[model samples]
Target: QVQLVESGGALVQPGGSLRLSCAASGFPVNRYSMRWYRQAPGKEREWVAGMSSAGDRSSYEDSVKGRFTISRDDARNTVYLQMNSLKPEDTAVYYCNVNVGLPADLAWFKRNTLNKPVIMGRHTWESIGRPLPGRKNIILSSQPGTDDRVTWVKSVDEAIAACGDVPEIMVIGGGRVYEQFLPKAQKLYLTHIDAEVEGDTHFPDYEPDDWESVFSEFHDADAQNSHSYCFEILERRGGGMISLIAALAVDRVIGMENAMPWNFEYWGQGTQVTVS
Candidate 1:
């Protein structure tokens, strides 16, 4: 129920001073720490200051320390940022955030997966640095392993074989491995982050129609979590379009072009086709 509202941006001449206010509601301003962040034009977001209510001490970015001041008014439930000697570098959108101290659900999932086998690609393992504690870690790698903590295998089948007949096996990845296992995976625990950012490696794209979402929960952006997110659990349905397409392809009696029999005319054209 917490809401944080930042005052509108201000325009000031070089070396001018400006004061910005953040009015917080539905949560105590004195109980939680407030943070200020700014993303300059065509630049990355940067932390400006953090005000702590517990110790009554605030920390500022080294460059902004001398010219920026952060303070809060308990009675007004508002926090303010004052900047002196403002320059062109300050031309960007600013945000005020509240640290509500939300629990880490991913950590809980990892903890509960305890001792179960986890399958991931070598690059994923490399990115993680070390084996995830309490779980049987299996990495798809051709090279010999130096870490006794994780078992290294050469292929997806090898990783599955190494896992024995566990009821459930977890697959974490760096795109390629996820693409390989998507066809075989029965369920997925997906966290949908509502933000657009530049990235190379990404989760494999799949049709949502193939899976049934069994559980979901949403969280708004907080100081710790930068973006609003939704956690979902999806289980694959049986005999989806892939299975039907494969069967039709194997039979060879009917061509996919006329399989649906409007779709045929629009097939080679740039139009979409569907079969009921």
Candidate 2:
């Protein structure tokens, strides 16, 4: 059986085309076929298609035929998915699967391997507030934090290094860190709270012309009382390095708290910092 490892996310402009590659390892190139799936944020999965290692194409479903193309380079044992006519809704996780064999033969593979996997690396940022008393234990039990993910940075260079990893879900809460990673982040999980608290801290301002909301769910006023906040996922209209650089520049002053020192080197560029 072959294993598929995907590349990190990229931002593309509307109506643009994106070519993402999936490299398969662990199994011989000629033994299996490559399949691609499209999963939009908070949405169900859509089977894009499959391509043989020999470069032969087959569409498992027709709905996605016009907008997607599957191709392979036998020499590299890599499969590619090229999506065109891009729209905001197309922003989501794209996975590459290697079909081991006939459907029945794959049953055992699914039953034994899928559930015993480790998450490996998960990176996210959270707001600065009271710590979850038993967060370390709760994390082992599978629970979402009261706020977003907690991001900790001892120094600026370390924060940037963490941002460079480009985690799948980049939680933004600390003002300075958010500003630093916003540009490099492919998606933003934003919680727009309804009630305004008298405070100097604010969320980053992103131009509407450059970003689009892929998914949003509004909580009723009553729900706000139970942690009422509107959840939205936004993607850059055009995923570009220039935008990331601009975001880092704006993040320079994020460490101030009431004009007092919080961490002077929170945004400086040097060394690696841990986010826990």
Candidate that would win on TM-score: 1
> Which run of 10 residues does model 2 get worst, by summed lDDT?
265-274
Which regions of candidate 2 are displaced past 4 Å?
Answer: 52-57, 101-276
RMSD versus native structure for model 2:
22.6
TM-score of each: 0.49, 0.34
Alpha-carbon deviation at 100 in model 1, angstroms = 14
> What is the per-residue lDDT of model 2 for residues 43-123, given as tens digits with 9 covering 90 to 100?
555556765444333554445577888777568876677777777766767777653322221222222222121111112
Least accurate 10 contiguous residues by lDDT in model 1: 261-270
Q: Enumerate residue pairs that collide in model 1.
A: none
Q: Global lDDT of each model?
A: 0.61, 0.44
